Every structure is written in C-alpha cells, then in structure tokens.
Design a protein around this ligand. Structure first.
Ligand SMILES: NCCCC[C@H](NC(=O)N[C@H](CC1CCCCC1)C(=O)N[C@H]1C[C@H]2CC[C@@H]1C2)C(=O)O
Ligand SMILES: [Zn+2]
Ligand SMILES: [Zn+2]
Ligand SMILES: [Zn+2]
Length: 305
C-alpha cells in the first residue's frame, strides 16, 4: 500500500506513478526518460492542464539515496496538484499556465539499496574500474565545473564525480531531457536533505550569479513563507558561500543552460534525526516546503522569459 504519510519502497513508488497517472489522465502524463544502471525506468511526471505552448518547471527528488524525505516530497507535490486543482486559487492558476516535470526518484538503484542493504547509502550503484567500491555522486556528475574542488576523484568516496561528466545513465537521462526541452523550462528545483537550507548558484566555484540580488530576495522570501506554518528556520544563499563547494551540481548545470531560477532545497532537520527523519515529520515538512515551492512558482509565473 502506497501512503503519502510514510516512506514507500521503489516498487510502491513505481506502481504509484502508473496509478496517479491513469487516475488523473488530464492533469498528468508519464514517460520513461531513460533506464538506471540496473535497468530500472526513470519515470517523469508531466503535471499540468494540457494546453499549447506552455512554459515549464522541472523538479527532481531522490538524487541522493538516503535523503528519504525528499522522495516523499515529490509524491506530496503531485498529491497537492491532484487534490487541489480546481479547489485552490494558486495551485490552479499554476497548472493552467505551467507544466511541472516532476521526477520523483532520480537515483532509483541507490534508493532500493537503502531499503535492502544500507540505510546510509548516498550514491548510485554503478561499478568502477580498478576498485570494488561502488557508486558516483550524481550531484557531482553534471557538466558544470566538473570534478573540481569539493568533488572527489576517489571512487570509494561519498562525493566521487564519476569517470566523465554524465557518466551515470541517470544524470545523462535528466540532462538529455532538459536539453530536449530547454526552450520551455523556466525553473529548476532539486529536492534534498538535510540542513534546512535553500541554495542557488554557484556551488562549483566562489562566484555569484548575474541575478544574485533577485535570487537573494527570492530565497529570502520563500524561507520567510515556509517559516509561517510551524516557524521552521531555514538559512539560504549561494551554494559555495553558504554550504561548501559542490561542483558538478544539477542546479549549476541547469542555470548555465540559461535556466535563471535554479534552487536546491535541503529539507528537515538540523541534526536531531538527520536522514532518518521520523515518518511523523513527513506531513509537516512537506506542507511547509510546499509553501516555499508555490511561492517560487508564483514568482516565476510573474517573471516569464
Ligand atoms: N548543487 C548545490 C548544492 C549541493 C549540496 C548537497 N548537500 C548535501 O548532499 N548534503 C548532505 C546532507 C547532510 C550531511 C551532514 C551535514 C549536514 C547535511 C550530505 O550528505 N552531504 C555529503 C557531501 C559531503 C559533506 C557531507 C556529506 C559528504 C551536495 O552535497 O550535493
Ligand atoms: Zn542530497
Ligand atoms: Zn496540503
Ligand atoms: Zn518583478
């Protein structure tokens, strides 16, 4: 049984994507955009009222395996879209004027592995020449300052950059889709955990984006919004300046393709529970996070380009 208030295994998520599609065929369609290293189909949900020449927002969750609240947040947002379309002003406006490409789990092989073998797995589950060490960090795998400081050339390491930018079938699939749909995609959002942080470019070097100011004011305002449900406290900023150098990120790759609004959400908590966030925090984290998401999507709508 699927539940939006529990963490579901991959078999549960896969069946849910087939089902939420067939049950809401006018709001949602589903493609496979690639296959994983282990041959799993990477489903993508095109969410929105079918209409011609629509701009789009891309979102991904599940890039990293152990960050379970993130996978639960993609399903939640799809949940909000289906339940509140026709019932809430803003959501409704958003689905008529925009399509949402929601990739609920990028790193499907890593996720299965956190359910079967190791709860604290992050990377993919591809093999590496010369070692029996497994996995590439997808969010060091993108062609954007690829494999510079903050990424590791060691395969045994948790930030390993891969053998080439886009070496992971999963990264390649997600970058191929986005190049294939570049002229419609107006924003890029990537959901992660933990640390209650909203980051924007750049993470691959210490530099600030052309619209730093606008992204500063926009991150300030979504943190502020998010903070109005339960008063949860989020910090924000440019990635290199806020967290650490983290090159080969999808957020930077997308921005350098000309997707001007690009954000990484690092959800609950600050460390009490970490990656192992009680299922009893799903509902609240997603609800407070949805307010930040819609807040960004309403900005974008007002600032098309
Ligand atoms: N693309 C721009 C933003 C990228 C930032 C993103 N952050 C991210 O993954 N953070 C988590 C979450 C926790 C980890 C404990 C401290 C609090 C946060 C994590 O597991 N990071 C790993 C990276 C190294 C530093 C810690 C490990 C090794 C990333 O590293 O790709
Ligand atoms: Zn992450
Ligand atoms: Zn809700
Ligand atoms: Zn304006």
């Amino acid at each position: 049984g699927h539940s939006y208030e529990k963490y579901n295994n991959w078999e549960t998520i896969e069946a849910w994507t087939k089902q939420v599609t067939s049950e809401n065929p006018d709001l949602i369609s589903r493609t496979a955009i690639g296959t994983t290293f282990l041959g799993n189909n990477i489903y993508l949900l095109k969410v929105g009222k079918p209409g011609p020449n629509k701009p789009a927002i891309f979102m991904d969750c599940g890039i990293h395996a152990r960050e379970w609240i993130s996978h639960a947040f993609c399903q939640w947002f799809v949940r909000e879209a289906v339940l509140t379309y026709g019932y809430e002003s803003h959501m409704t406006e958003f689905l008529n004027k925009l399509d949402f490409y929601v990739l609920p789990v990028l790193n499907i092989d890593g996720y299965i592995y956190t359910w079967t073998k190791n709860r604290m797995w992050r990377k993919t589950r591809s093999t590496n020449a010369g070692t029996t060490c497994i996995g590439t960090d997808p969010n060091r795998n993108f062609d954007a300052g690829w494999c510079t400081t903050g990424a590791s050339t060691d395969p045994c390491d948790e930030t390993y950059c891969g053998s080439a930018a886009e070496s992971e079938k999963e990264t390649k699939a997600l970058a191929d889709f986005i190049r294939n749909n570049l002229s419609s995609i107006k924003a890029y959002l990537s959901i992660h955990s933990y640390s209650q942080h909203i980051v924007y470019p750049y993470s691959y070097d210490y530099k600030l984006p052309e619209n730093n100011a606008e992204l500063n004011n926009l991150a300030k305002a979504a943190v502020k919004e998010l903070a109005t449900l339960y008063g949860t406290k989020y910090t924000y900023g440019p990635g290199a300046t806020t967290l650490y150098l983290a090159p080969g990120g999808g957020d930077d790759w997308a921005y350098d393709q000309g997707i001007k609004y690009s954000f990484t959400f690092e959800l609950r908590d600050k460390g009490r529970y970490g990656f192992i966030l009680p299922e009893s925090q799903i509902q609240a984290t997603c609800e407070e996070t949805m307010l930040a998401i819609k807040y960004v999507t309403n900005y974008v709508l007002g600032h098309l380009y």
